[PDB]
Amino acid sequence: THYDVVIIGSGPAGSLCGIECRKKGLSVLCIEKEQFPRFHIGESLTGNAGQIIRDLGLAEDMDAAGFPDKPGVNVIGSLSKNEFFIPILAPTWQVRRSDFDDMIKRKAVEHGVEYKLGMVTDVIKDGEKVVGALYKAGVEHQVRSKVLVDASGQNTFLSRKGVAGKRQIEFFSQQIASFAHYKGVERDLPPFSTNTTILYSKQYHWSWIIPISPDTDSLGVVIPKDLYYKECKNPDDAIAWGMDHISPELKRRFKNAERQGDSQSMADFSYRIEPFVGDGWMCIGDAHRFLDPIFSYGVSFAMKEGIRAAEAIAQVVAGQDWKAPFYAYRDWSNGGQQIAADLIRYFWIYPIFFGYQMQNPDLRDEVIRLLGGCCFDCEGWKAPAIFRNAIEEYDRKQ
Numbered sequence: 001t002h003y004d005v006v007i008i009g010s011g012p013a014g015s016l017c018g019i020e021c022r023k024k025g026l027s028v029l030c031i032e033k034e035q036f037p038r039f040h041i042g043e044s045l046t047g048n049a050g051q052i053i054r055d056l057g058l059a060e061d062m063d064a065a066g067f068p069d070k071p072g073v074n075v076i077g078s079l080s081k082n083e084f085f086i087p088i089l090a091p092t093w094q095v096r097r098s099d100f101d102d103m104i105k106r107k108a109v110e111h112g113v114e115y116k117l118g119m120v121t122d123v124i125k126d127g128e129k130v131v132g133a134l135y136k137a138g139v140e141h142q143v144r145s146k147v148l149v150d151a152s153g154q155n156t157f158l159s160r161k162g163v164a165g166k167r168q169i170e171f172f173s174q175q176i177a178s179f180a181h182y183k184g185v186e187r188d189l190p191p192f193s194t195n196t197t198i199l200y201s202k203q204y205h206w207s208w209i210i211p212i213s214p215d216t217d218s219l220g221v222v223i224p225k226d227l228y229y230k231e232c233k234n235p236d237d238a239i240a241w242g243m244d245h246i247s248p249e250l251k252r253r254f255k256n257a258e259r260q261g262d263s264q265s266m267a268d269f270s271y272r273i274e275p276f277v278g279d280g281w282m283c284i285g286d287a288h289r290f291l292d293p294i295f296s297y298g299v300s301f302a303m304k305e306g307i308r309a310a311e312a313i314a315q316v317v318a319g320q321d322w323k324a325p326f327y328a329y330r331d332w333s334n335g336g337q338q339i340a341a342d343l344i345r346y347f348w349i350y351p352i353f354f355g356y357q358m359q360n361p362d363l364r365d366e367v368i369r370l371l372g373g374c375c376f377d378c379e380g381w382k383a384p385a386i387f388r389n390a391i392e393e394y395d396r397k398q
């Protein structure tokens with residue numbers, strides 16, 4: 001059995017890639033190992049994500065599913081008492097990922113992507129060229145594809161399989177995130193009751209509060225890996241650590257709150273995988289690159305890469321050799337992702353200066369677009385340059 005495109009995984013990257021490939025008239029199979037709906041962390045969307053969601057015809061459905069509108073994000077430093085607000089670029093939402101991912105997958109089915117509940121386990125190769133995959137599903141099946149798209153997220157299938165490059169981890173910023181859902185959290189005053197709230201103390205010590213339904217808020221406490229394994233060891237203790245040590249806002253807001261279900265812990269390690277394109281295959285989303293979620297780029301970038309990949313895939317299915325089209329995708333992805341990574345690094349090194357710089361109308365407006373996810377067409381902007389130069393200056397002097 002043959003498809004133009006086989007996609008591993010139906011998170012936001014895989015779903016959007018499938019939809020876009022269908023719009024280009026390609027045949028598409030998506031293999032997803034989990035039954036939807038399924039829990040997934042990563043709840044606060046960018047302005048650009050909202051635009052894609054609107055373009056998919058889902059705006060009214062987002063509201064009806066009870067996903068709060070997101071007016072922007074408040075960043076509060078507990079140690080310095082510096083706080084700044086970044087208004088949203090365009091209308092968007094805070095989501096419960098189980099329901100959200102289900103709604104998007106449904107759109108991909110409406111677009112005619114064929115789905116299988118199954119686990120991809122291997123690739124099929126013709127020399128160095130990838131030409132299909134094996135998946136389980138109580139039998140091992142074989143499928144043939146002109147392009148195998150890895151949208152496996154954090155599972156990073158093609159990297160683990162040795163087809164894509166090795167995972168390059170950013171060791172200096174390794175964190176562990178611990179989170180749970182609560183009811184009864186005290187929200188800010190309308191019209192900003194459903195802003196995302198970020199509270200931070202020391203470098204790489206921070207917490208989020210994200211409203212995800214009419215009465216439910218997502219709480220995360222994120223701390224360096226070493227601190228976690230020394231003082232906490234489990235998510236309940238890490239959250240309590242943040243309550244006690246990151247910000248008095250937490251105790252205040254959570255005074256009458258009640259936890260819903262159990263807490264979980266998860267690695268928050270930045271990484272990139274290179275190469276992430278090759279003959280007959282490519283990675284999109286977290287399957288090749290993960291940024292610090294303090295600025296919530298993940299879902300937005302996953303969707304953007306799925307969309308841009310479809311353009312490359314269409315060129316190869318139409319007859320082109322893989323290199324020019326895939327290297328164009330690669331270069332475009334690296335461009336945007338590096339700007340986002342620089343913004344995050346710049347913030348962590350100079351969080352107060354970052355705040356003071358928002359008082360500058362020109363920078364402020366660029367940062368609004370950048371935090372909105374518009375990092376992929378920035379030739380001639382001032383901010384990306386400032387970030388890059390600062391980071392290089394900081395590094396060269398250490």
Ligand SMILES: Cc1cc2nc3c(=O)[nH]c(=O)nc-3n(C[C@H](O)[C@H](O)[C@H](O)COP(=O)(O)OP(=O)(O)OC[C@H]3O[C@@H](n4cnc5c(N)ncnc54)[C@H](O)[C@@H]3O)c2cc1C
Nearest residue numbers: 009011012013033042043044120153285286293296298299
């Ligand atoms: C602590 C934390 C907080 C975060 N907060 C935010 C936030 O506020 N906003 C935001 O935008 N992002 C956030 N993120 C990031 C966000 O969750 C990811 O960037 C996003 O899920 C990436 O989408 P994806 O499609 O690439 O992968 P995923 O969404 O993970 O989807 C991948 C899919 O592939 C399937 N799969 C995996 N392996 C296989 C296989 N072998 N065969 C078949 N199927 C497979 C999985 O079941 C899964 O459904 C956060 C992440 C973390 C860790």
